[PDB]
Amino acid sequence: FNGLTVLPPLLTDEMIAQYTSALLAGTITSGWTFGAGAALQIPFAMQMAYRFNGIGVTQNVLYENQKLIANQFNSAIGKIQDSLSSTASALGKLQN
Amino acid sequence: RLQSLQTYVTQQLIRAAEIRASANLAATKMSECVLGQSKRVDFCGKGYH
Amino acid sequence: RLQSLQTYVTQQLIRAAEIRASANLAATKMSECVLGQSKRVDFCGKGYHLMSFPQSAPHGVVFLHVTYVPAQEKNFTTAPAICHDGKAHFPREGVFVSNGTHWFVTQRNFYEPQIITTDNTFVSGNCDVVIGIVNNTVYDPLQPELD
Amino acid sequence: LQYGSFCTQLNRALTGIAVEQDKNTQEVFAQVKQIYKTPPIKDFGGFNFS
Amino acid sequence: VAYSNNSIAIPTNFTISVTTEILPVSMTKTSVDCTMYICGDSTECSNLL
C-alpha cells in the first residue's frame, strides 16, 4: 500500500500442474523417449526392465520379481503421503 | 528512505541469484532425472537411480 | 557521486557473478560436449548427443550441437520374454517384437528385425513367473550347422 | 529530482528480477512441447500412480 | 499416447539435427579512477574526498 505491489506469475498453479501432469504421463507411457523426440509407447514393466539394465541389473531380475518390485514401489509412495501429512520441516526450503 | 530502498533492492538482487542457481539445478534435474535415467551418483536420490 | 559509484560497482559485482556462472557452464559444455560424448539428457541439445562444435562469438561462445533424433515410428506387438521349451528367453540387447504374425528381436532405437536365436537371447527360469510371456520358436544355428 | 537516476535504476533492477521469475519457471516446467494425457486404462504392470 | 501392456513404437528412420546454444563468457573490462569521477581534478574536492 506504500507504493509496494506483488505482480502475478505468468503461469498459474493450474498451468504448472498441467505441465507436471504431462511430464508424468510422458514418463509412465513412453519412458525417456519423449525427452529426445516423439513419445514412443512402451509397456511399463518393459520400461522398468530397461531401467534395471541401466543400473547393471539383468532384466529377468525385474520380470521374475515384478509383483514384489511393484509392491515395494506402491508402499514407498504411501510413505510420501505419511511423511508429508505428518512432518513440519521437509518444505522448510520453500517456506524460507 | 532512499538508503532503505537501495538496501532492499540489493538484498533482492543477491537473493534472486540464489533462486536462479536453484532453478537451474531444478531444470537440470527435470532433464536428467525425469526425462532420462542419470548415472551421476547422488544427483537423483540415493541408491542407483 | 560516491553513492552513484557504489551503486554501479555493486551492480557490476552482481552482474559479474552471472557471467562467471555462464562461463563455468560454457567451460563444462566445452569439456562434456566438445571433448566428449555426453549421456546427460538435454545437456548438449535435444535428441541423443553425437558431438558438438564450438564457434567463437563476441564475449561468448556458440555450440553447434549434433544430435540423433528418431523419426518414423511404427507400432509393433511386444513381449518381455519368449516361452520356448519350458525355458523363458530374454533379449541380450534389444526387444522382442511381432509384425502381427512373426516374432523378431530388434535394437531399441532403430528397427532392424532379426530372427530370434540363442545368440540374440539368454535363458532364465521358466514360463511360470514372467507376466505377458509369449510362446514361440527360438532358433539354434549349431543344430543345422551339424545337420 | 535532485538525485537524478536513482529511482529509475531501482525500478529497472526490480523489473529484471520479476522477468527472471517467469523465465525460471518456464525453464523448469515447460520442458515438453505436447500436453501428454495418461491412458484411461491404468494397466501399468501393478505399479500405482493415483 | 497409444499405450497398452503389449504395444511398442519403434523408429524406422532418424534425423540428424544441428542446434545452436549461445553462452556469455565475459563482459567488457571497465575501470574507474574514482577520484577523477567524484572530483574531476579539483584539488579542493580531492582534499575533501
Side-chain angles (χ1 to χ4, degrees):
Chain A
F1 296 110
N2 304 289
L4 322 187
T5 78
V6 181
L7 297 155
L10 174 61
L11 300 173
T12 66
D13 294 315
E14 189 188 338
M15 292 169 159
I16 306 309
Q18 290 170 247
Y19 281 125
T20 305
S21 175
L23 291 159
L24 298 163
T27 297
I28 75 188
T29 60
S30 72
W32 54 65
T33 64
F34 83 106
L40 303 172
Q41 76 282 1
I42 181 167
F44 187 81
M46 194 102 57
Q47 194 213 130
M48 286 297 304
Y50 291 18
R51 305 311 183 136
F52 274 44
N53 289 182
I55 62 161
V57 179
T58 311
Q59 50 191 355
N60 76 294
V61 183
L62 186 119
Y63 298 125
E64 297 162 7
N65 299 116
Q66 182 180 328
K67 290 187 178 183
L68 175 65
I69 293 160
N71 280 348
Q72 289 190 131
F73 175 77
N74 294 340
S75 185
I77 292 295
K79 289 176 62 180
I80 302 304
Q81 305 172 121
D82 297 349
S83 180
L84 293 175
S85 189
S86 308
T87 195
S89 62
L91 279 73
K93 297 177 73 186
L94 296 179
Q95 188 62 59
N96 179 59
Chain B
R1 289 172 177 209
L2 181 56
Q3 195 72 8
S4 301
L5 190 62
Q6 291 222 245
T7 305
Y8 175 80
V9 178
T10 305
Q11 299 301 296
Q12 289 298 92
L13 288 164
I14 294 173
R15 188 176 289 121
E18 289 150 19
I19 290 290
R20 199 203 290 181
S22 185
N24 286 343
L25 181 65
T28 307
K29 291 188 183 214
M30 193 72 79
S31 298
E32 296 182 33
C33 305
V34 170
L35 264 56
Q37 186 181 18
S38 197
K39 277 188 175 184
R40 294 173 59 204
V41 171
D42 304 341
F43 193 65
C44 312
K46 295 182 182 175
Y48 309 101
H49 173 251
Chain C
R1 287 169 182 201
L2 182 60
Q3 184 190 344
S4 300
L5 191 64
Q6 282 169 351
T7 299
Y8 170 82
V9 174
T10 301
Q11 293 269 1
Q12 289 307 100
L13 288 164
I14 293 169
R15 185 174 288 126
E18 311 177 42
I19 293 292
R20 175 158 152 185
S22 182
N24 286 345
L25 182 62
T28 305
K29 283 159 191 274
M30 194 73 76
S31 304
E32 296 181 34
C33 310
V34 178
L35 269 49
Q37 187 184 16
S38 198
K39 284 181 183 173
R40 296 171 64 186
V41 174
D42 312 335
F43 194 64
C44 314
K46 292 180 181 180
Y48 307 115
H49 168 254
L50 294 164
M51 66 215 298
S52 310
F53 305 116
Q55 297 287 267
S56 59
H59 291 296
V61 66
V62 177
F63 296 103
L64 304 181
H65 296 297
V66 192
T67 72
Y68 184 108
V69 181
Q72 286 177 3
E73 66 272 30
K74 292 185 186 179
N75 292 332
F76 300 96
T77 296
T78 184
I82 303 301
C83 275
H84 182 45
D85 196 5
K87 295 176 177 180
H89 287 255
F90 303 91
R92 284 184 169 116
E93 274 267 39
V95 59
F96 299 128
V97 285
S98 172
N99 74 1
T101 62
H102 289 68
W103 285 92
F104 302 98
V105 58
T106 182
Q107 65 180 293
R108 303 176 162 122
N109 292 303
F110 185 84
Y111 183 62
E112 189 198 285
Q114 300 184 1
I115 295 296
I116 297 164
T117 79
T118 303
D119 301 343
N120 305 91
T121 69
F122 68 95
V123 171
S124 183
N126 77 359
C127 293
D128 300 338
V129 68
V130 181
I131 295 154
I133 191 163
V134 303
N135 294 336
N136 204 73
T137 194
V138 177
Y139 177 86
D140 176 8
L142 188 147
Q143 184 71 44
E145 188 64 14
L146 268 58
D147 292 333
Chain D
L1 257 51
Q2 299 175 318
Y3 286 83
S5 308
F6 281 132
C7 281
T8 295
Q9 194 168 17
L10 289 166
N11 278 209
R12 185 189 292 134
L14 288 187
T15 299
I17 296 172
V19 174
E20 283 182 51
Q21 302 322 302
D22 293 334
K23 187 186 172 186
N24 285 353
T25 311
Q26 178 185 5
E27 296 317 279
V28 179
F29 292 104
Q31 290 202 11
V32 286
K33 288 181 179 180
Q34 301 181 45
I35 297 300
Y36 298 108
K37 282 176 152 172
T38 181
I41 303 172
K42 304 288 167 63
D43 61 339
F44 308 119
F47 294 77
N48 190 0
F49 307 115
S50 74
Chain E
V1 178
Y3 183 88
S4 83
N5 67 79
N6 74 321
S7 186
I8 195 162
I10 303 188
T12 68
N13 209 341
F14 51 78
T15 78
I16 305 304
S17 59
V18 188
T19 64
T20 166
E21 179 169 32
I22 306 103
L23 282 172
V25 175
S26 64
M27 60 187 194
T28 51
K29 298 176 172 182
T30 310
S31 183
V32 183
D33 180 6
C34 70
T35 299
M36 187 173 174
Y37 175 79
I38 296 174
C39 291
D41 83 38
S42 164
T43 304
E44 311 92 327
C45 181
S46 301
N47 288 340
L48 285 169
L49 181 59

